[PDB]
């Protein structure tokens, strides 16, 4: 580590080396600031109407809010106790404070205990069945409450159905049962038995985080702070959650009003329209 | 037309007993649950019992153990509510409750509050 | 988490918009119903589940919730809204009731 020579020493292995060119290491601009560019959606995001929420809907229909034009600070939610089970698989339950999507949906149902499991990618069952499934490549984050204080005859669920229903897909459907109009045949759907009288046969409340990371005009970001852009510096930037290095040059692509980003041939980054200043 | 065909008024005296009826007409009587709050002259309802005329599964509330001894009747539908020893503060404008139905009727019908439709109103007065 | 009812009477005329607040006796969050009484005859539902609107009852009548500290709203007095009322809980075995409010001229 001390000079050119004795870095050659050490790739060679030997205290004395050879006359000639040899390759030792890399050399790497390091970045000599940090650039967090943001779009101005400082309008925060009422996650409370749906973990502060009074309300919440059955899983035979189960609501979906389309979340736009918001700040997701996660800092208060990841650190509060009362998630007792926070597993998320395509992002991480302490790096949500910094990502940012681009448009995500929110749903809310209620399940049993016994299958909370089966809320995640690649699981079966009754609801994963015929009521709802997730889908098997699904990126976002499983919220589950040890509600059991929180939360009666009025939790429904189906049991006969043609075929399994695809992933965020809402199927209603009040009769014609499997095999046995108003014949044996009849109410496809049963209530949970659930009383406020009534551990794994306690009810367990489940939110979904589908964090949809397709590419779009950035809506919810998280609670960061932007900082001066600077141009011809190899800098730590942050575009809208796209990190690197390299220079900020102004540039005379023709960019169409819905096109938001390019790209090379290597699938990376080329040319990235600030949120701020278009 | 459903309808809690609740019995008409009985003026007794303390000491003997009581068959009062609320009855189904016009619908499934087991469908809604059938709850019991009394409502004392000049004064609002309380809760003074329950049971699931279901199975006859009852639950006497603690100050009622004993001295009351709640029934139900599913022949003629009369709901029961029978004191072996008829009291004095008992004389109340009793209410035999249904259950409402605003999501999923047919999969509960019960327990979902405690006023969808009465009759007249039995008149126990002992 | 203390019950307490508000108020003891209450003077308006027509036209007028009131609030009182029936305050939450203890964790009743989710089951909370509504009850419209008028004098001599049977209550019916104002808002059941604490959120929902009952059938038979003009919207005039309205509650509302906040925390611990429930509300019912009058947004049009109308000159036949001299009455008594009660409010009820329902979430948790047993269930209260209200106390009342009289009008004057």
């Known amino acids: 580590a001390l000079d050119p020579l004795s870095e050659t020493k050490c790739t060679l292995k030997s205290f004395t080396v050879e006359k000639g060119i040899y390759q030792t290491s890399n050399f790497r601009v390091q970045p000599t600031e940090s650039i967090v560019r943001f779009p101005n959606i400082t309008n925060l995001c009422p996650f409370g109407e749906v973990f502060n929420a009074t309300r919440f809907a059955s899983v035979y229909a189960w609501n979906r809010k389309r979340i736009s034009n918001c700040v997701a600070d996660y800092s208060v939610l990841y650190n509060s106790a009362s998630f007792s089970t926070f597993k998320c698989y395509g992002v991480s339950p302490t790096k949500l404070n910094d990502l940012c999507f681009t448009n995500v949906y929110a749903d809310s149902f209620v399940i049993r205990g016994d299958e909370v499991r089966q809320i995640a990618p690649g699981q079966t069952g009754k609801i994963a069945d015929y009521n709802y499934k997730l889908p098997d490549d699904f990126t976002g984050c499983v919220i589950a409450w040890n509600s059991n204080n929180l939360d009666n005859y009025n939790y429904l669920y189906r049991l006969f159905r043609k075929s399994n229903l695809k992933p965020f897909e809402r199927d209603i459907s009040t009769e014609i049962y499997q095999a046995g109009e108003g014949f044996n045949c009849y109410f496809p759907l049963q209530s949970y038995g659930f009383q406020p009288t009534n551990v794994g046969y306690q009810p367990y409340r489940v939110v979904v985080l589908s964090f949809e990371l397709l590419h779009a005009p950035a809506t919810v970001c998280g609670p960061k702070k932007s900082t001066n852009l600077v141009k011809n510096k190899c800098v730590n930037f942050n575009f809208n959650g796209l990190t690197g290095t390299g220079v900020l040059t102004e540039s005379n692509k023709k960019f169409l009003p819905f096109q938001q980003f390019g790209r090379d041939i290597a699938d990376t980054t080329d040319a990235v329209r600030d949120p701020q200043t278009l | 037309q459903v309808q809690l065909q609740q019995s008409g008024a009985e003026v007794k005296k303390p000491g003997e007993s009581l068959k009062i009826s609320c009855k189904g007409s016009?619908?499934?009587?087991?469908?809604?649950?059938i709850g019991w709050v009394r409502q004392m002259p000049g004064k609002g309802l309380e809760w003074m019992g329950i049971?699931?005329?279901?199975?006859?599964?009852?639950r006497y509330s603690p100050s009622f153990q004993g001295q009351v001894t709640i029934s139900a009747d599913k022949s003629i539908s009369t709901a029961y509510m029978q004191w072996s020893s008829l009291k004095a503060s008992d004389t109340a404008m009793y209410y035999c409750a249904r259950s409402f139905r605003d999501d999923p009727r047919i999969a509960v019908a019960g327990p979902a509050d405690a006023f969808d439709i009465w009759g007249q109103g039995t008149m126990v007065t002992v | 988490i203390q019950m307490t009812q508000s108020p003891s009477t209450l003077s308006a005329s027509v036209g007028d918009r009131v609030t009182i607040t029936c305050r939450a006796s203890?964790?009743?969050?989710?089951?909370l119903a509504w009850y419209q009484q008028k004098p001599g005859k049977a209550p019916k539902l104002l808002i059941y589940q604490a959120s929902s609107l009952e059938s038979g009852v003009p919207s005039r009548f309205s509650g509302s919730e906040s925390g611990t500290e429930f509300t019912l709203t009058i947004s049009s007095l109308q000159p036949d809204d001299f009455a008594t009322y009660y409010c009820q809980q329902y979430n948790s075995y047993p269930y209260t009731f209200g106390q009342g409010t009289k009008l004057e001229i």
């Open positions: 049971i699931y005329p279901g199975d006859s599964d009852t």
């Open positions: 203890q964790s009743i969050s989710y089951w």
């Open positions: 016009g619908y499934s009587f087991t469908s809604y649950w």
